[PDB]
Design a protein around this motif. Sequence first.
Motif: not given
Lengths: 354, 49, 51, 406
Positions: A275-285, D38-41, D72-75
Amino acid sequence: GIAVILVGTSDEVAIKDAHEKDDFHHLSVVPRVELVAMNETDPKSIITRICDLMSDRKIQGVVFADDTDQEAIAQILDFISAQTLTPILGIHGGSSMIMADKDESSMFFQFGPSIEQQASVMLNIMEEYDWYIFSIVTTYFPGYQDFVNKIRSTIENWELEEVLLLDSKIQNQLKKLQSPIILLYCTKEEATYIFEVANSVGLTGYGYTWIVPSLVAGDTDTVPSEFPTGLISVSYDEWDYGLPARVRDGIAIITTAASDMLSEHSFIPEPKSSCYNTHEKRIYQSNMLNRYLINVTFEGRDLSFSEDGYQMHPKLVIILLNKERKWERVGKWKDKSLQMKYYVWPDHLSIVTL
Amino acid sequence: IQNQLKKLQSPIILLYCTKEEATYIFEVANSVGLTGYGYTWIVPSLVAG
Amino acid sequence: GTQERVQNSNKKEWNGMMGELLSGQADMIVAPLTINNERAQYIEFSKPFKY
Amino acid sequence: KIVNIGAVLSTRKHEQMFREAVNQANKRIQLQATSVTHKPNAIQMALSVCEDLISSQVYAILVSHPPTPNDHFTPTPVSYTAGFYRIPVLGLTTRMSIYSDKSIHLSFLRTVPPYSHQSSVWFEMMRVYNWNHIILLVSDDHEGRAAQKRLETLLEEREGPKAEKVLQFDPGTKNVTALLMEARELEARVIILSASEDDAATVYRAAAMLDMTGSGYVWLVGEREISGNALRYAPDGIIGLQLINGKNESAHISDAVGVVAQAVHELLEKENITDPPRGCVGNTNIWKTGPLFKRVLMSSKYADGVTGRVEFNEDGDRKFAQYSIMNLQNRKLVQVGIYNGTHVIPNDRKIIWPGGETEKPRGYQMSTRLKIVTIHQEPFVYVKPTMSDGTCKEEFTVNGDPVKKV
Ligand SMILES: O=C(Nc1ccccc1)N[C@H]1C[C@H](C(=O)O)Nc2cc(Cl)cc(Cl)c21
C-alpha cells in the motif's frame, strides 16, 4: 485471502463461533479468517492498519463491523477501494448503515435497505392500515431530491398534504399542516429540535402518529424526550441480525463470488503487495471483474445488488415506540410483502350491520 | 394562543379593544397573521382613543 | 399514445404518434387526434375543425 | 494562543513564498508556519496528513494541486482525512466538481471557479446576440451532468431563449458520427460543447467530415476544449472562454492567507477557540468549532489578493470573478473582451465568425420540409397497396372530378 475485522466493544471472542461453520463447507477456496480488532481507533490508524494487515496476511477481500463512531468511516475506504481494487462489505454497524454514492469506481456495496425500498415499505404500511392522506417535510439530508422525485413519481399510477423543505417562515410553513399522517426523513440530532418545534405547533398524542425511516434514531436505545409516546419506524439491523449470522452471510457472499470468478475465466484477485508505492501500481492496471460478482446465491435467496450497492428485496421489520420508551417488533416484511401483527394503536364506536 | 389563532379563516378580521393592548395584539398578529395585501383591519372608535 | 410509466420506476413516455411528435421524429399531426387536458401540457392545438 | 497553519503545495519555492505570506500575516493573532510537499500514490499522502500536520493543533489547512494528470485524485485524500473532523480547508487549484456539493465533503472553500459556472457567460452571450434557439451537447459524466443541471436551471429561471435538445453521450467514443447526423439537420445553428479534452477531435474531425463548421455556424466550448483542439484540430472561428488565473499558485496564496488572518479576529470575542485536537490517533472528538469557522469563512470578505474582490459563493469557490472572452484567429489566440463579474465588456479586434464573414448570422433557416405522420382510419384515412407500376390507379368521384392520392 478473505479476512474479517471486528473492531468494537462486543463479544468478538464469541462471534468466532462462525469459524467452524466456515470451516466445514461453503468455501471452494478455503479462506483464512483472521480478526484484527482495535480500540476506538482514529481514521488514520484505521487506514494504516487496514492496508498493513491486507498486505501482511495476503488478503484479497474483507468485511468489517464496528461501533457507530461516525458514518464517515463508510467513506474512508471508498478511496482505498479503487486504490487497491478489492471487495468491501460494511455490515452490522450504524457506521456501515449510511449511503455513500458516486464513488463507484470500485467495490464496497453495503447491507440493509435503500431509500426507495424503505420508502415503499412506508407506503405499504400506509395502505395496509388505510391511512389515506400524508404530509412530508425534510431538510438537506442526503437524498432530498431523490426522495421528492421518488414520491412525486410513485403517485402517478395520492392523497398527499404537501412536501416541504425547511432551512419568520417556519410558522407560516407549518400552518399548512393538514394531513392525518406526518412523515420526516432526518436523524436524531435534528430530530430533537424538530419534535420541539412540533410540540410548539403540531399535535403530539392522540391525533397524530409519527413514522420515520431507520436512520432517524441511528442506534436503538437512546431517546431524546421530545418524541411522542409512539413512533413507527422500520429497520432490520439490531433486532434480529446476529453478528455470527451476519459474518456468515458475508463469507458466503465472498466465497460464491470467488466461485463465479474462478468459473467464468479462472482468475484469482492477484495479491496486492504494498500500500506504499508505484511498484505495487503494476497489478493496479490488471483486469477488473467486479460486476459479475453480484448474481450469486446461498442460504437459498439471491443476493443481487444494483450497480450502486443495495441488495434487492431485503428482509425487513417494523418497530414502534411503546409506552416504556422502547421499540417492539410489530411488522414483518418479506418478498415485497407486509404483515402488521397489531391493529390501530391508542369517538371509538364499534358498529355492526348485515 | 397559537392553537387559537390557527383557526384564522376569514378574509376580514375584527377586534374590539384599545390601543394599549392593540400594540401587543398587532405584534402577535405579525407573528402569525398576514398584515398587508391579503387582510384588512377594521376596528371601532375607542380602539385608538 | 398516452403517458405511461416505463422501466417500472424510470420515466413517463408516450406510446405512439404523440411521442413520435415529441421524440423528434414527427413535426405535425393530421389525423382524428383527440383533444383533452392531459395531452394539452406538451402540445399546441389549433382551433378544432370538426366537432 | 498561537494558531499554527499548515499547507501542502507542489512547488517548494512557492512554499517559501507562503512563508513570506505567513510573515505578512504576522504583520496582520499568533501564527506558526508549517507545510508539507506532495507525493504520488495518494495513500502515502493520507499517511502524511496526520503523520505531519494533524499531529499539531490546526484550525485551517491549505491544499493545492500538482501538474500530474490525476486532477481528481489529488485533493481527495487530504479532503477525507481532515473532513473526519469537519475542518475548514482552502483549495487553490483544479476545480472539477470534486466537492461541488456538500454531500461528500463538508466545509471546503476554493479560490478558483469550477468549470460548471462558465455556462452563465454563454447565457448572457445569448442576450448580447439575441439568439433564442440553441443546441446542447453534453457527455454523461458528473461534470457534464452538473453542466446540464446549471444551464437548464438558469434558462428555466430566465422565464426568451429556450433549449432545444439535450443530446447526451459517453466519454469513451471513437466516433459520434451517428449523433451529429441527426444533430446538424435540425433548426438552429449555434452549438455548445463541454466534455473532456481529447473528445474535441472525436467531434471536430467528425464535424468537418460532415462539414459541420463551414458557415452559418457558431460554436462555444470550455477551456479544456480550447487548449486541446486549438493545438490539434480546432475548426477556425470557434469561440470559447478563458480564465485569468490560469496555472499559477502564487496569487492564490495571497488570496488565501488574508481571509485566514481575518478569520481569527471573529472568535477573539467569546474564547470558544478551545483546542484543535493534535494527533490523529487518540480521540474521535468532534472539534465542534468547525461549523462556526465555516460559517464565518463563508463571509470573510477581503481585498488582499492580486485580483480585487476575491470572495465566496454559497459553494465556497471564487465568486464574482473575471473571465476573458477568448477567440481564435485561424491559427492564433486573442482576447476580444473581459467579462468583468457581470459587466458586458467586449474589446475591439477583427471578430471573425465561422467561414470568415464580418456579419453576425441569424439564428435559423426555417426549412421548407415537414415530416408528417398519420394513422390508419377508413373514414379519414384510406390506404391502398400500389399498382404494378409503382403508383395506385387514378379514379373519379361519382361527380367525375379526380381524387388526390399521395
Ligand atoms: O382507440 C384507438 N385505437 C385502438 C385500436 C385497437 C384497439 C384498441 C384501441 N384510438 C383512438 C385514439 C386516437 C385518437 O386520437 O382519438 N386514434 C383514434 C382515431 C379515431 Cl378516428 C378514433 C379513435 Cl377511438 C381513436
